[PDB]
Design an enzyme around this catalytic site. Structure first.
Site, PDB file in Angstrom:
ATOM      1  N   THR A 115       0.824  -1.200   0.000  1.00  8.26           N
ATOM      2  CA  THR A 115       0.000   0.000   0.000  1.00  8.26           C
ATOM      3  C   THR A 115       0.864   1.257   0.000  1.00  8.26           C
ATOM      4  O   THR A 115       0.563   2.228  -0.695  1.00  8.26           O
ATOM      5  CB  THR A 115      -0.940   0.028   1.219  1.00  8.26           C
ATOM      6  N   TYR A 150       4.800 -13.024   7.242  1.00  5.01           N
ATOM      7  CA  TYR A 150       3.834 -12.652   6.219  1.00  5.01           C
ATOM      8  C   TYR A 150       3.995 -13.513   4.973  1.00  5.01           C
ATOM      9  O   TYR A 150       5.021 -13.458   4.295  1.00  5.01           O
ATOM     10  CB  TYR A 150       3.984 -11.164   5.886  1.00  5.01           C
ATOM     11  N   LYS A 160       0.565 -13.642   9.081  1.00  9.75           N
ATOM     12  CA  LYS A 160      -0.385 -13.013   8.170  1.00  9.75           C
ATOM     13  C   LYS A 160      -0.510 -13.825   6.885  1.00  9.75           C
ATOM     14  O   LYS A 160       0.491 -14.175   6.260  1.00  9.75           O
ATOM     15  CB  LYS A 160       0.034 -11.577   7.846  1.00  9.75           C
TER      16      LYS A 160
END
Ligand SMILES: [Mg+2]
Ligand SMILES: [Mg+2]
Ligand SMILES: [Mg+2]
Ligand SMILES: [Mg+2]
Lengths: 291, 290, 290, 291
Positions: B45, B133, B162
């Site tokens: 992001t 992750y 995650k």
């Protein structure tokens, strides 16, 4: 300065201090040229280009080009995440005498066709040397269709060559047909060397020349001679080694192979680990039977 | 401080091309005002990978100072080399980060031994928790649940996981094989509802930049065990989540913020700003949400 | 001996939808006059799976009689159950079939043990060679090279291997692991050139129904070791090979024969006949190759 | 009668002499009904429908409907390769009182959207009972987009329901969104049972009820009660068995499981093999744990 035949990927030797071992890099370069490679391609995955700091990257480009001394064409991999840095690296490579640069659209998020196109347009318009478009989904995360690739070649002046490493021979068939045999393409996937040449590949970029330049060069020669039967025999003889390289890693196997060949080039940078004892013995055998 | 609920990914505003820290500060305030339970800077992001080392360091420092420990900050310190990943983890920690997030990035496959040692190196170098992750889509590496659990149990500081594969079965396995002791988090927007119901402890999303209310309500509904309200809230925001995915995080989030009174510029090339047609569609989606 | 160009036959239907044996006879004569080295009836091209047991039995009989052993006939006897596959294999043998082909068709995954016994059962039940056929796209089952080699070496009558995965690496592995002892055949049209160069002994194709000349010429060029001529011949016919695969075998081959003065009807529903546009394009392709 | 909740797939027991074992089939049906299933779904993969001869297929349909005695709705799988035969089976099922039929586009050779649409159109127009459109690329080889599915549902009167077995929850999200919640969809993928219900699935077709109808039913009830917590717990308790069924095969594990449950139902038809000793041992352990 035609770019063809056996194009040797160079590795990036690291010194004990972890820094660059340029002297060793020079020797490997001499080993390749004497092995009879038709060109040099530095700073690809084989050379762990992405592991290098900017200073290191610049230094490697400089030393490589100075060392080669234009004896054979040099195609430098200038691929980076941002367009700005890709352009900057392309311009830097040209300023030092690079005959050509190679661009793979590496990205962590997906890029759309418009974004990919503009990326190549920006790079081509910023330099005065040819750009080799490199399609490798496995490593870049992007898979450019033959249609897109052809549009970039036609519309972007400096984009003149295409390297395919998808492992899908049909890509080259489409390039040949849709390109009408006027778009030169190259092989980037070792286990497909034979098929690639038969399909019409103009060249074969590989790190194998670091270990078996002779067999590699003979394969290309056999194809030029149109000797289908001999080419097949040569391919299957070296295939096992080619499979092993893909199997255990490029820099991992190449650096270990060069070490076994009396050329100290250290180990890869973490997280990549050096070839283990078991793998080293197996490679040793593979090399002894090929020699 | 517990890491849970709505974890907001921040974008990285650019001005003249350089960083626009003032705009970043404003976006962070929005998120915190918006009710996020934690901040996660420098992910996809935030176009973390597009930043120079100097820019990355600047964003980390500024972000931590701005948040001022009002909520936990979990910094994405993933990089190609172990040495650099370790350095970024220690840097983030020294500057006040409550936790760091590590994704095994590589332009070439790494073996399970190479991955495990990568995490071991990072974990041993810091005194704060590491969120493992898994995102093969963006990393190129797909870690099995078995490997992930080996890393969590053998590396002290690796305590959280995650999942962004979009494959709910990965979370089921984490739940069963981890016997419910290993907390996992959702990183895949369109799976938000199912992830929570599967047991996800938190949801890392850039959506809170645009619809922090609906995001928070979904989480609350799950906490209340209200399946029906949760389903309704999810489907109401789904179209937006789908759009973000198809058109890109930075692209859509930066465009959306422009519609919400916060100019944050465009993505960094080769990523392009949302086109006029896409922008109009986004306006429609947000309106409909309203 | 099975080698060179093995021609897949189609199954002509009358306007009503029933068998048209006369037309089938004409198509078989066209293939043999075309120069094929073998005939392969009742495969995907022949819509074998679409036929009733009575229809299937008759097509086999009529085919073997029409051929009259001018060239070897390799009948596809693949079926869901082992019992019915065995029965079909025996029926084919009893009528003179030189060999049979077996693909492990299944609407649900089968394990390696189940696949192995299936071939063993078939092999031990007959007295003619069996061609093992690996085609995941049409069977739902993908057999590993090692598995295939294990079946060939342990099942007497299993002697040949056909590959249709489009993955040249399978043939490379068949060559190395088999040490050149296991003869493999190409079942994927757009890979004809590469397959031959890789060591393929034959090429099973429905293309001979339309361009038997160019097909044979490709094989001959490979036999001569003329790499350049082979390449030129392959690319000349590739556009057609691509079209067939893209628009469907029975669909394109039946439409092609129509444009070749040999009415053979249309495919059996739900498969539809080639549409106008596709028909004109095929017409253009053929006129260019002739 | 509404089709909802737990829809039980039946197996097809074969007698020692290879033929049909109708008495055993009857006992299995009673076990399902007594177990609280809301519907019966015969002749799917669980029942090895495709392994049956025409006479056998017809008999199972007749016997099944008679046994059920309309205590619950029966949805017969009538899918076949040819449109002609699929239509015949759909009509035969209806003639014997079937409440509905299920249709999966089976095809060894791929099929285009036009061909798929007409297939369903033909079947729908040939009968007077609802059709459950069934998407399972893993079995059929065809993957119908939600867009295509919705067109079929809207344009073909008798196609009224959709079953999804892709394992991709997003397909169900799309069905709910694009269908505006007016197109009832059903789950066909066991390990997705919880997520499917959460997403809004109206029913769950499974062979699991042959072994654990109680836990299956409790999950559905928890979902109806809106009890997220309980639903999750119930699902995870039964997931290991659901995983095993998927891993070792439907007919294999179900027939083995019933045997372990005091209901001799023989073995699957070759090439499908009976569960091995190790598998039986593991399965016995799972069942004892759940009961
Ligand atoms: Mg150009
Ligand atoms: Mg730990
Ligand atoms: Mg044999
Ligand atoms: Mg309808």
């Amino acid at each position: 300065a035609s770019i063809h035949g056996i194009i040797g990927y160079t590795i990036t030797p690291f010194a004990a201090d972890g820094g660059l071992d340029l002297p060793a890099l020079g020797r490997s370069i001499e080993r390749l040229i004497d092995g009879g490679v038709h060109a040099i391609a530095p700073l690809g995955s084989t050379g762990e280009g992405a592991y290098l700091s900017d200073p290191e990257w610049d230094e490697v480009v400089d030393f490589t080009l100075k060392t080669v001394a234009h004896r054979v064409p040099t195609i430098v991999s200038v691929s980076d995440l941002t367009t700005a840095k890709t352009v900057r690296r392309a311009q830097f490579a040209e300023s030092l005498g690079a005959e050509a640069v190679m661009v793979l659209p590496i990205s962590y998020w997906k890029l759309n066709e418009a974004e990919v196109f503009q990326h190549y347009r920006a790079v081509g318009e910023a330099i005065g040397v040819p750009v080799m478009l490199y399609n490798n989904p496995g490593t870049s995360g992007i898979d450019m269709s033959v249609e897109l690739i052809l549009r970039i070649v036609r519309e972007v002046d400096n984009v003149t060559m295409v390297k395919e490493s998808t492992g899908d021979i049909q890509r080259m068939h489409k390039l040949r047909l849709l390109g009408e045999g006027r778009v030169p393409f190259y092989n980037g996937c070792n286990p497909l060397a034979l098929e690639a040449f038969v399909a019409g590949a103009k060249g074969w970029c590989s790190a194998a020349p670091n270990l078996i330049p002779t067999l590699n060069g003979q394969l290309y020669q056999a194809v030029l001679d149109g000797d289908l039967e001999k080419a097949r025999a040569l391919f299957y003889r070296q295939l096992p080694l080619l499979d092993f390289i893909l199997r255990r890693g490029l820099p991992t196997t190449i650096k270990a192979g060069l070490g076994l060949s009396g050329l100290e080039v250290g180990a890869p940078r973490l997280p990549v680990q050096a070839l283990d004892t078991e793998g080293c013995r197996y490679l040793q055998g593979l090399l002894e039977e090929l020699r």
